[PDB]
Amino acid sequence: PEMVRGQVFDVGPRYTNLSYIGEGAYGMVCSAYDNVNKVRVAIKKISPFEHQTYCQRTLREIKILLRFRHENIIGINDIIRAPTIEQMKDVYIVQDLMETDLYKLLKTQHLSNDHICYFLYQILRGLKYIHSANVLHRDLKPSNLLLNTTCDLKICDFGLARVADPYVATRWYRAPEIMLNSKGYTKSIDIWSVGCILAEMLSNRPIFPGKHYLDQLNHILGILGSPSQEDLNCIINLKARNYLLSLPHKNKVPWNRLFPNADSKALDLLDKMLTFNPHKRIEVEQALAHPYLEQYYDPSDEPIAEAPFKFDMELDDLPKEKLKELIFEETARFQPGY
Ligand SMILES: Nc1ncnc2c1ncn2[C@@H]1O[C@H](COP(=O)(O)OP(N)(=O)O)[C@@H](O)[C@H]1O
Ligand SMILES: *[C@@H]1[C@@H](C(=O)OC(C)(C)C)C(=O)CC[C@@]1(Cc1ccccc1)C(=O)OC
C-alpha cells in the first residue's frame, strides 16, 4: 500500500502519486492522480471508529455530501474502505482537488470589492441550496470555503450539520443565540456566520473574536449595541434574557466607522446579516436579491435541492459500533457488487 509521511494511504492502484496537503484531528488529506478518469483529486483519510463523535461527523458528512449536487458545494467522487466491516479501520473520501481556502487566502490577500462580491455570491448560492434541503451547515467559516484553480468556491465540511427543526476550535462565526444557549436554532445561524465572513473579507480581521462566549458576546454587543426587549424575546433561555437586561447600555457602532472604505451596499447587507434578532435576520434568498449582488443575481441559475431531508438523523445516542455499521452501509455503493 502507498505511504505518506509514514502513514498508510491504501488507495492504489487507481489513485497514485500522492502528495501531502494537511491533516485534521483524525485524518490526513493528500492530492492524488485518478489513473482511471485521468484527473487530479483530493483524498481524505478518515480514522473515526474509536470515538463516537468522529463517527457521528463522518456519517453526517458522507450522508449529506452524497445527497447534495451543487457547483458551490464540495462533492464526493469515490469512497474507499475494506470489503468487510471488521477490516474497516479507515475510510478514504475522494473529492475534487481544491487549491486553497478563504482562510489561507485572507492571510496574504486584501480582496477588492469586486472579488469580495464574487465570493459572497458563491457562498450564498451554495447556502441557498443547503437551506432548501432543510439542512443547517452550522460551521461556516473561512477555512470551510475552498477555492479551486479557476477560483470557484465550494462549501465543505458538513460534519456538524443538522436537519433543520427549531466541540469546534474556532467559534468566532457562531450566532449569539448559540452563545446564550438558546433552545432552538434556525437557518438564521448560518446567515450570521456568512455575515462574519463578509466582515472578515472587508478588513482581513475577524469581527467578533474572543477567548470565550462571554468575551465574544461582549464584542458583539459592543458593535451592535444593546438589544431591545423585542430582540431579547427571541432568546428562549430566560436566564440569558435576565443576564442581557442586566448589562450596561451599549450604543451601536455605525458600520462605516468600522469599515470606512467598504461599499455602502456591502455594509447594508452586512447589517441585515449581523442582526441580533434571528427572526429579523435576512434570509438566504433575500440576501441573494440584495442590491450588493445585483451583478450576479440570477434565480433561474440558482438551483434548490430536489428533495429536502426533513429526516432528523438522530445519531447523538448511537454507540460507535452502530455508527460504524451505518458508515459501512452508506459507503457500500462504491464497492464492486452492490
Ligand atoms: N477537496 C480538497 N482539496 C484540497 N485540499 C483540501 C480538500 N479538503 C480538505 N483540504 C485541505 O486539507 C486540510 C485538512 O482538511 P480537513 O480534513 O477538513 O481538516 P480541518 N481541521 O480543517 O477540518 C486543510 O488544509 C484543507 O484545506
Ligand atoms: C480568484 C481568486 C483566487 O485566489 O484564485 C486562485 C486560483 C485560488 C488563486 C481570488 O483571489 C480573487 C478572485 C479570482 C478570480 C477572479 C478574477 C478576476 C475577476 C474576478 C474574479 C482572481 O483571480 O483574482 C485576481
Q: Are 190 and 137 in contact (CB under 8 A)?
A: yes
| Nearest-atom index, ligand 2, CA of 148 | 8
Pairing, β 145-147 against β 135-136? unpaired
Q: Give the three cell numbers for residue 148.
A: 479551486
Question: Structure resolution in Å?
Answer: 2.0
Report CA torsion sign: 232, 233, 239, 240: negative
Q: Would you state the cell numbers that stand for residue 112, as one nine-digit string?
A: 477588492
Cell matching residue 300:
433561474
CA angle 98, 120, 231 (to 5 degrees): 130
DSSP result, 86-114? GG---EEEEEEPP-EEHHHHHTT----HH
Which CATH number among 3.30.200.20, 3.40.30.10, 3.40.50.10860, 1.10.150.20 corresponds to the domain 3-97+317-334? 3.30.200.20
10 Å Cβ neighbour count for 263?
A: 17
Q: Write the CB contacts of 305 (distance below 8 Å, at least 6 apart in sequence).
A: 67, 68, 129, 132, 133
Q: Report the distance separating Cα 2 and Cα 15, nearest Å.
A: 9
Contact 193, 250 (CB under 8 A): no
CATH class, 100-301 region: mainly alpha
Per-residue cell: 28: 490526513
8 Å CB contact between 101 and 145 = yes
Structural biology method used: X-ray
Cα separation, 315 vs 251, whole angstroms: 43
Q: Rounded to the nearest 10 degrees, how much is the dihedral formed by the CA atoms of 80, 83, 89, 91?
A: 20
DSSP for 154-206, please give it. Answer: EE---TT-EE-----S--TTS-HHHHTT-S---THHHHHHHHHHHHHHHHSS-
**Active-site residue among 139, 157, 190, 231?**
139
Peptide bond into 48 cis (omega under 30): no
Read off the amino acid at residue 242: N
- Between the alpha carbon of residue 271 and those of residues 94, 115, 173, 267, 305, the distances in Å are 38, 20, 15, 6, 28
Is the C-beta atom of 147 inside 6 A of ligand 2?
A: yes
Q: What DSSP element (H or E) covers 265? A: helix 264-273
Q: Is 24 helix (H, G, I), strand (E, B) or coil?
A: coil
Give the whole-angstrom CA distance, residue 296 versus residue 270. Answer: 17
Testing ligand 1's pocket by substitution, the residue of 4, 18, 20, 21 carrying the most ligand atoms inside 8 A of its CB is 21
Q: What proportions of the chain, in percent to the nearest 5, are helix, strand and coil?
A: 40, 15, 45
Give the separation between CA 121 and CA 207, rounded to whole angstroms.
20
Query: How many angstroms is it from 96 CA to the middle of ligand 2?
Result: 18
Would you state the torsion angle of the CA atoms of residues 164, 169, 172, 174, taken in this order, to the nearest 10 degrees? 10
Cell 463517527 locates to 55
Is the beta carbon of 160 within 6 A of some atom in ligand 1? no
CA 17 to the chain's CA centroid: 29
> Which segments within 210-259 are labelled E, that is strand?
none
d(CA 15, CA 139): 30
Phi then psi for residue 138, to 5 deg, are: 75, -5
Q: How far, in Å, CA of 292 to CA of 272, rounded?
A: 12
Domain ranges of the chain: 3-97+317-334, 100-301
80 - beta bridge partners? Answer: 92
Cβ atoms of residues 291 and 265 within 8 Å: yes
Q: Smallest Cα–Cα separation from 281: which of 161, 156, 172, 196? A: 196
